[PDB]
Symmetry: C3
Subunit: 486 residues, 3 copies
């Protein structure tokens, strides 16, 4: 005969490379980036409740150093701690520092309950030139520096507090470390001193350390802070013959501990986001991010890859003939379509049903990549100033392992998605072609290039009947059969 | 040019929604749940060896507290520790309690070897009103409370035990802390006392802490317990001038520790199962469970999902015409089938080569799926009464991380399986169609809807020859061609 | 119409079983093992830097014990610690030994920087019979044992070292624990002694514990060792009235610690490899290994599986509705088998074969792509039980190995099912490519053979195989033989 109908698919001048199981660069018409690499320049104060430490890290917040008054009564989902935090009080350290920091941050509030402690015969409310408050010598406002009396006495202290409330209590207490033996006896009479804090099932006892040390805020002495949790029904004893930095009460512990801490210089802005990193919040719908392993809230999974491209279109093939060799750059209002050549000339029209089928499957894939919120809050430290050994080895190894596994998952996921997407769109093309083959029945012959040679005169109107499925092959059959075989 | 034979597949009234990579809800004929949500109200005492602590926790078992005698000589894969266990002996604490408990649990037995310690001049076998056995004062039966002689003497003790055997020895010993100086001298004469326990490479020196503890069951005196492991070829030394709570021997350590502990109130039953949780045993062949992260033995992976349905059958399309886009609800003795209409009438017959090819490919998925061990005994603690800091944060993070990784694995796997199953069953339908097409050769024409218009006369005789593959096309070729093209 | 043309695929006498999502046993033509099970009987000294401790473990190397001098100035990616290392000096303990060992190992070098400490009036360079060099009393050569002068004098020592360099400093110092009070006053005059070491950001003090320990190398006394890190800008104060075992300088810390330690008896050889285990180096391109969970460098992932076979060819069918495969076909994967008047024959199609070959090579190189290098990890074997921290360390590693073993199983199954589907798809594509070359001049026998309904000599048979055969020329002849 001579009128020809072709089936084919769209194509663009320049597409995007994606990966599959079998190769790392297959060009497809459209693609979607799955790794978020952009963050906001600020931290969003909504909807998570953020509290800014400003000059106070969370530990001198609990101790009550000068400049930390704004944190009294505070409640947070995320405590924002500044790397710029400045010391304003007595030089201290904290054995197992990170555990106290963790407990304070996880707890999520500063609610202090003043208690009267009947210390006997010793001086109270010791103050320091290294801890000026409102330009006067002062001290941590949650702590009480006991010293020997003017009569030169420091008798054994032995105070019990019973937890008969309905919440667990957190006591913070310290041990003072003088610079010389002379200082030890000048302050506490007894040498050595001893600080002992006991519950029903535990006991921390500390012998003070004596010796000259580097000047810190003018001083060679130090305080080491410790803490004790007291469950309801439990008791705590404070027992000393010297060097106790006494609590003035206790912090309330929440039963549910759901909060956390983020150490970052990034300012708090006005945006809205439930995902925070140390580099700023993230506002995205992508499932992965390469911005930071440190993240909090409703977040994308951290991976090592800078880019993972999800195919959102069929394979892109460059350019009458059908789909067996090429794609059609001219087809721009559909994914698949008909190209014809008859007496009245040529033309191209899109096929809606096959185009809509391929699009629905791709959107389906996209929606499935929207995971339900898997909100994470208190996790583990992921950056460290200096080496510590065993426990830090374990922490870095855990995070390193986790990241490798998720990066693998991401990599395999997009390869599998893309392989299927390509097969799905290849399959929609062949089904379109099969549909028409069966429409034409014995009236036409498969040319092999995705085109049917039709063996009867075919109108522009006869073409239209083929494309909308009203073509009745019986009408043309007699004529067609003997155009074909004779 | 009149008979029609159609190929199709079964369909049911109400299928089951499953998931693929592309779809959140696609309907299949049958499906299998992969997440176990049901557990037994009991713990199964076989094939794992369970020991019921009953009234004693495992640490009290090791010390030999009153009420713990049933544990003498016990061996276990899993020690069942009851939440209702109470302290019945002398008030004690254990500095690294969690680790002592873990070591005892992991070791898997209470095999005590008595040793005679030739203590000099001190009284042995001290007993107490705080540790009654049958309303008579007693003590931990693995421990030996040394006190001063009637002659008011507590001479230096210096006793050595060399390990010349072939296993490592666990020694448990304690230090007693009196309430007052008077109690100290009444018991041990010397004040202060000291206890020093050494091996070749290690030394533990404890100075008692007098009068710094709150009351427990009316006593503010307390014992602190320690442990020492002695490798073969090594030795242990006990050196004390007071307050030593001496061991009566040592426990044997198993160099291949593979036991653990489970804290639960769930009674031991008479079921059979290799998987235990704090909620009770699980008896299933499903590969996943959402019951508890605390599981021991040969267990299904714990996941977050409440349900993951695995398709065990083709797509369900409920409701003269073959398979192209609906299915036959009256096909019940096969998965795929022939439906015909000729002069003699109508009929449906199942094809079984096709039906079995599909079932065999599905069945294999299930056996691959429900396959190999997951043999895990001693793990880590996974629930916590109260925050502790760094190490517990790391323990929680490791577990939470593991669960997300397994939940992802479960989610993906079921989607991959279901996508494959759906392609497999679709493929089988089309292989069946192609088989018949190539049987008929030029005697029939593809009607486009999964049917063949047969252009010769065809009774029930030749219908079955089509269905059993004996149909000779050449017999009717002349008749059939004549009807096709005239 | 009776010449017949057929399309099929290669087969072999016997090939290899593989696994997919559905079956644990599907025979394919060729396959590749993805799990390395063989190691070298030695450790490769290239291209990573290995340093052999010999008789010296790393902690003694840091202290400068006899037999560790060869470690002076050493730099490593992997410190090789021998299980037969023994103590050769004063008996000592290190509180948190494992952390010191780990820091020394991770740091990756023994770059010691000597300093003059102007100790006042005390005697220096004390030696012991328990620490013999040649055959003379000696000592840890990084340490300086201070004792009272000849005039019974040990004045308070108070020495400062300021860090005005651009690297963190590691100081290792010690506290001596005498066996008796008489030994204490004999050595240090004062009783008790006191050792206090402090920076701006950390402080400690150690009161010596006087008492007898079990005899070791003729002594009941002990030294306990400590370390202190001093950052740039910080400084350190050594303050003492007795029992200090003084540093003679400090070690330099790299800002970028990239090294680790391997404890193994395996000898260092002459081979080349970038993956090391406790059982020897591994030289392989395979992505997985079942040799050891302890591995360092550029290594395959450790998995529990002994074997994971990846299909590198199509299903192997002996001797669908293609027959099975052709064993006669051995210069391609897919080909043509015909029979006309002048005889039979078989030829291989290039593209279909090459297309399948290319897609399979693609998998292989995506698989064997394989970078990221891991050095310092965690300890994975333990001599005695410890409780909590060791429990977590073992649990982490167990979890990791399970997850990766699962990944390996899933991956191979997915690749195999795809490799099979692709190679069957390429067969069927070759078929209906030919179908459209014949048009109306041939029919589908239903077994992959086209009944050519016209006289088809060797040279129309080739014409089909080069894409030239014109279906017009024989159309009338064909139709006449088909319907007549
Ligand atoms: C994330 O990836 C982008 C490009 O994909 C890259 O430019 C950026 O450096 C990456 N971010 C990090 C923190 O590596
Ligand atoms: C204790 O026994 C050990 C080993 O027999 C011995 O070396 C030491 O001198 C003894 N101590 C006393 C005080 O007798
Ligand atoms: C300290 O108080 C406890 C009870 O609160 C008491 O048992 C103990 O004896 C007291 N300490 C002294 C040295 O008396
Ligand atoms: C487990 O899943 C079932 C549904 O299959 C749900 O009803 C149940 O609440 C889940 N259990 C837990 C502990 O979440
Ligand atoms: C001890 O050394 C410190 C640190 O340099 C110094 O500040 C202090 O004054 C010294 N004390 C003396 C020399 O008595
Ligand atoms: C590794 O797998 C091989 C099988 O290829 C097996 O023979 C060998 O025992 C395995 N190695 C180990 C250490 O289990």
């Amino acid at each position: 005969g001579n009128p020809v109908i072709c089936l084919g698919h769209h194509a663009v001048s320049n597409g995007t490379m994606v990966k599959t199981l079998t190769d790392d660069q297959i060009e497809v018409v459209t693609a979607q980036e799955l790794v978020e690499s952009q963050h906001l320049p600020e931290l969003c104060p909504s909807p998570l409740r953020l509290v800014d430490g400003q000059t106070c890290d969370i530990v001198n917040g609990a101790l009550g150093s000068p400049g930390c008054d704004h944190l009294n009564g505070a409640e947070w989902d995320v405590f924002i701690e500044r790397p710029t935090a400045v010391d304003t009080c007595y030089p201290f350290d904290v054995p197992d520092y990170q555990s106290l920091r963790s407990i304070l941050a996880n707890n999520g509030k500063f609610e202090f309950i003043a208690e009267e402690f009947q210390w006997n015969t010793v001086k109270q409310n010791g103050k320091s030139g290294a801890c000026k408050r409102a330009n006067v010598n002062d001290f941590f406002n949650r702590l009480n520096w006991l010293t020997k009396s003017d009569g030169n006495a420091y008798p054994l202290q032995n105070l019990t507090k019973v937890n008969n409330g309905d919440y667990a209590r957190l006591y913070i207490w310290g041990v003072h470390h003088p610079s010389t033996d002379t200082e030890q006896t000048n302050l506490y009479k007894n040498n050595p001193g001893r600080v002992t804090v006991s519950t029903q099932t535990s006991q921390t006892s500390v012998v003070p350390n004596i010796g000259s040390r580097p000047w810190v805020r003018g001083l060679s002495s130090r305080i080491s802070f410790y803490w004790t949790i007291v469950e309801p029904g439990d008791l705590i004893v404070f027992n000393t013959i010297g060097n106790l930095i006494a609590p003035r009460g206790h912090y309330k512990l929440n039963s549910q501990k759901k909060s956390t801490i983020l150490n970052t210089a990034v300012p708090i802005g006005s945006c809205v986001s439930k995902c925070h990193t140390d580099k700023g919040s993230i506002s995205t719908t992508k499932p992965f991010q390469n911005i930071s392993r440190i993240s909090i809230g409703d977040c994308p999974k951290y991976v090592k890859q800078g880019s993972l491209k999800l195919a959102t279109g069929m394979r892109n093939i460059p350019e009458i003939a059908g789909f067996i060799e090429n794609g059609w750059q001219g087809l721009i209002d559909g994914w698949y379509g008909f190209r014809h050549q008859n007496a009245e000339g040529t033309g191209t029209a899109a096929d809606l049903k096959s185009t809509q089928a391929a699009i629905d499957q791709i959107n389906g894939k996209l929606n499935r990549l929207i995971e339900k919120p898997n909100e994470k809050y208190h996790q583990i430290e992921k950056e460290f100033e200096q080496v510590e050994g065993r426990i830090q080895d374990l922490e870095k190894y855990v995070e390193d392992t986790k990241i490798d596994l998720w990066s693998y998952n991401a990599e395999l996921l997009v390869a599998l998605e893309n392989q299927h997407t390509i097969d799905v769109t290849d399959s929609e093309m062949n089904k379109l072609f099969e549909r028409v083959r069966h429409q034409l029945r014995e009236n036409a012959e498969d040319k092999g290039n995705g085109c049917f040679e039709i063996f009867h005169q075919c109108d522009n109107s006869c073409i239209e009947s083929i494309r909308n499925g009203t073509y009745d092959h019986d009408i043309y059959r007699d004529e067609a059969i003997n155009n074909r075989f004779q």
